[PDB]
Amino acid sequence: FNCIDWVHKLTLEITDFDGSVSTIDLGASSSRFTNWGSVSLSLDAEGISGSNSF
Amino acid sequence: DPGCSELIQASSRITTCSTEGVNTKCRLSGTALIRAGSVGAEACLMLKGVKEDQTKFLKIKTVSSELSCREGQSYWTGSFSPKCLSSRRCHLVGECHVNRCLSWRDNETSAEFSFVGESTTMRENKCFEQCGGWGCGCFNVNPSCLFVHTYLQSVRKEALRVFNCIDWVHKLTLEITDFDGSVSTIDLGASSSRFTNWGSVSLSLDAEGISGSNSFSFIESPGKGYAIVDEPFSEIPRQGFLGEIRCNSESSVLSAHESCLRAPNLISYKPMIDQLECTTNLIDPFVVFERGSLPQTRNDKTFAASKGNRGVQAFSKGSVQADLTLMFDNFEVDFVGAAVSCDAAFLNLTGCYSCNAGARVCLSITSTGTGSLSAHNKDGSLHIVLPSENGTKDQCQILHFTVPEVEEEFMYSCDGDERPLLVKGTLIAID
Amino acid sequence: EDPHLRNRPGKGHNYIDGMTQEDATCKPVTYAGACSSFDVLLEKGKFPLFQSYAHHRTLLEAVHDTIIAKADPPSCDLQSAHGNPCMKEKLVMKTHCPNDYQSAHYLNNDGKMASVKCPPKYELTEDCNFCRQMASLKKGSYPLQDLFCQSSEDDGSKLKTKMKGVCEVGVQALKKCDGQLSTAHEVVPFAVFKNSKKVYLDKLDLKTEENLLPDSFVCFEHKGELKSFDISQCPKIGGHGSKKCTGDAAFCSAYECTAQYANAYCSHANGSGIVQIQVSGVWKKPLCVGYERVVVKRELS
Numbered sequence A: 001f002n003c004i005d006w007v008h009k010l011t012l013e014i015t016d017f018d019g020s021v022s023t024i025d026l027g028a029s030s031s032r033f034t035n036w037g038s039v040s041l042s043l044d045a046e047g048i049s050g051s052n053s054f
Numbered sequence B: 001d002p003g004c005s006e007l008i009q010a011s012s013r014i015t016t017c018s019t020e021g022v023n024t025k026c027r028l029s030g031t032a033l034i035r036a037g038s039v040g041a042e043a044c045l046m047l048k049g050v051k052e053d054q055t056k057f058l059k060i061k062t063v064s065s066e067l068s069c070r071e072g073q074s075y076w077t078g079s080f081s082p083k084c085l086s087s088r089r090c091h092l093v094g095e096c097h098v099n100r101c102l103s104w105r106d107n108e109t110s111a112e113f114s115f116v117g118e119s120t121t122m123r124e125n126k127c128f129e130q131c132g133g134w135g136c137g138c139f140n141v142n143p144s145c146l147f148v149h150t151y152l153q154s155v156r157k158e159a160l161r162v163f164n165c166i167d168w169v170h171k172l173t174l175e176i177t178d179f180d181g182s183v184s185t186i187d188l189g190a191s192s193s194r195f196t197n198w199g200s201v202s203l204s205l206d207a208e209g210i211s212g213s214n215s216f217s218f219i220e221s222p223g224k225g226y227a228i229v230d231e232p233f234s235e236i237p238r239q240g241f242l243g244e245i246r247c248n249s250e251s252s253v254l255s256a257h258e259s260c261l262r263a264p265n266l267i268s269y270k271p272m273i274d275q276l277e278c279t280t281n282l283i284d285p286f287v288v289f290e291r292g293s294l295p296q297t298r299n300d301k302t303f304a305a306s307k308g309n310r311g312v313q314a315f316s317k318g319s320v321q322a323d324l325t326l327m328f329d330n331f332e333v334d335f336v337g338a339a340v341s342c343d344a345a346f347l348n349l350t351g352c353y354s355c356n357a358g359a360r361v362c363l364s365i366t367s368t369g370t371g372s373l374s375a376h377n378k379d380g381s382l383h384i385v386l387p388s389e390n391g392t393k394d395q396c397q398i399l400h401f402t403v404p405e406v407e408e409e410f411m412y413s414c415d416g417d418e419r420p421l422l423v424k425g426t427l428i429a430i431d
Numbered sequence C: 001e002d003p004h005l006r007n008r009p010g011k012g013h014n015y016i017d018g019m020t021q022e023d024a025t026c027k028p029v030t031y032a033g034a035c036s037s038f039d040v041l042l043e044k045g046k047f048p049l050f051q052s053y054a055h056h057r058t059l060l061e062a063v064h065d066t067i068i069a070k071a072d073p074p075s076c077d078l079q080s081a082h083g084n085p086c087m088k089e090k091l092v093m094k095t096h097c098p099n100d101y102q103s104a105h106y107l108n109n110d111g112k113m114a115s116v117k118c119p120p121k122y123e124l125t126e127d128c129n130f131c132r133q134m135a136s137l138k139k140g141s142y143p144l145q146d147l148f149c150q151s152s153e154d155d156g157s158k159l160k161t162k163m164k165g166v167c168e169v170g171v172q173a174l175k176k177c178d179g180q181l182s183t184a185h186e187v188v189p190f191a192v193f194k195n196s197k198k199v200y201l202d203k204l205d206l207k208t209e210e211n212l213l214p215d216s217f218v219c220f221e222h223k224g225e226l227k228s229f230d231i232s233q234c235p236k237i238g239g240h241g242s243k244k245c246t247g248d249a250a251f252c253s254a255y256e257c258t259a260q261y262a263n264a265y266c267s268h269a270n271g272s273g274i275v276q277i278q279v280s281g282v283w284k285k286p287l288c289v290g291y292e293r294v295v296v297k298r299e300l301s
Helices: B285-291 C036-042 C048-052 C060-064 C250-254
Strands: A009-015 A021-027 B015-019 B024-028 B031-035 B060-062 B066-070 B074-077 B086-089 B123-130 B144-151 B160-164 B167-177 B183-189 B193-195 B199-203 B217-220 B226-229 B267-269 B278-280 B296-298 B301-304 B313-315 B323-328 B331-334 B342-349 B359-367 B371-376 B383-388 B391-395 B405-413 B419-426 C075-077 C114-117 C166-169 C207-209 C219-221 C264-266 C274-279 C282-284 C296-298
Touching: B066 B183, B123 B267, B144 B267, B160 B285, B167 B199, B183 B193, B183 B199, B217 B285, B226 B285, B342 B371, B342 B419, B359 B371, B359 B383, B359 B419, B383 B391, C036 C048
Parallel strands: C075 C114
Antiparallel strands: A009 A021, B015 B024, B024 B331, B031 B323, B060 B167, B066 B167, B066 B313, B074 B160, B086 B144, B123 B144, B160 B217, B167 B183, B193 B199, B199 B323, B217 B226, B267 B278, B296 B301, B301 B313, B342 B359, B359 B391, B371 B383, B371 B405, B405 B419, C166 C296, C207 C274, C219 C264, C274 C282
């Protein structure tokens, strides 16, 4: 396969108030679903450009 | 203390009268042109009928100067997070085939997810191929399938209406005072017209205007403040830009209704045999909303929110140059009373000299009947006309002077005999 | 949704002095009520305003509810041309008169209720001005105007028609027009308040305020043609006494539903409540806004 865009993905876990730990991920400005709300990323970091020739 | 700022004469061609039972009534039907007042002033209009006792005034109070933006293309957007639903089906079982998962339409609902029904929200149907055999939960070597029925949902609590401004309209919130005594508040911008009880009014000559505003967009929040984004308006939705998933109303965003438009292929699917993760990479409008929120300094104007109606506005620091066009659309007016006596008093004299705003005067008129007070100076160059009601009221209008130390004795008359009156006050040099 | 527009809330009586033939099948007005004065109200392509305001009263129902007073005489005759207090307002109007009808009721200027009557077996004409000779004749009247009725007791008699740009519009003559003018036969909205006159208006700004009122919930007798039943006998919220009654979602959410203990099934009115209007720039509650095709004289000079 090929890569058209490099999304800044961050492997982040969520430790709930009771003790349960849920490991999820966040990319660019994506959102997830947990047992208490919704997590999302507001600002990315860096960004590799030019990957259509690979 | 603030009073009238413009006082002109009315022509008798568009004004007639008719006596019907010892009560002569007036009939106004014509077009008049009056100068617009300054910020925080009024604009009376002295009128004379066919008799010597009818005196009706048409005051136009100016609140402030607003620089609103004219809308044209708008849409409702917001954040959305889909929910992935997976259901693996073996081959040769119901609809598990090698030709049903590849050539699968995005609008037909499979039998595995047909229990929900024909929903009215944004959704899509995808068919992903998965391996079979005994290593993944099957009894045949043929490849199985994975039915996906992912629908879009709203995770936020509010909505944003992203619009643009093709031309800044200079509006003026005016408080029109009727002849009988009713008070109406309207607004005139650029060349818009407003209907009233005595006819209609519209803005004539304009001057304050901002050109080139298509490269900036605004965000309206129902109940919260406004915002501005440094980018042109988004017409065709596409990836990699703010404006992927749009709608047409607040209900289409809070409930993610299927009536809104969206870009093709936005839910990123991660098939993992049995697991499913359908997420999107849309731009959160709340990040830019909280990043570029008002107040914002742009060029030489301070963009701020409104105070009366809804819509984005702007604050300017220049002068006010506008003309008001008064139109009488066949209005009937009567004057039962006449002209009686009454005493006047002095309150305060503010304003300026040798400027457009002039000098505002404050006079305390105390009479017992309904009429009008007439006053004039000595050489006959300045006339003062003010209404006189039953009680003590405070009135006044513009007074032109060419001296900062105004001190001239005036002569007022409520019905015929003149009375002495001395006024004074310190003005300021302003244009 | 829920075709329950035939039930008449409250009393619902369509009777007048003269039409004594439909007295047995006129009070009250149920689902099986037969009468020409009410069947033409639900017809398609004739009375659109009554179809838009189906869950509201009429003229006779407003008269029987002590809302609209009666004229003197309330029923005139169109046989002999000796003169009667009814032609002065009928000649200025222009309404269609269907075949096989003897009476024709409308709204007068004094805010009361005036009507005519044809002697048997002479019917009316095509315009309704005079009466001519005689299928089978009906046993009721025909509403000439397109008005409705409601429960309102708002005061407003010290008013006057404020329509600028016209001369003698409708019946109220504001001023003469002998010079240049242009008359026709258009429609003008009007509204009559409590003990007032026919005040005409320029534009119509109606607004129906939906609220949990007993006049906005229909109900019929439940058993194993449906018959109407009084909805005011149902209990309130959090109660299970007196005359039991059940419903669907709105009636069950507002009041209670005793299921088997109930003897009458209730429902919700498809659009009903308090109707407002914008007259003289002040929110007022009228009685029955209607239309009519009269002589409208405008001003040109």
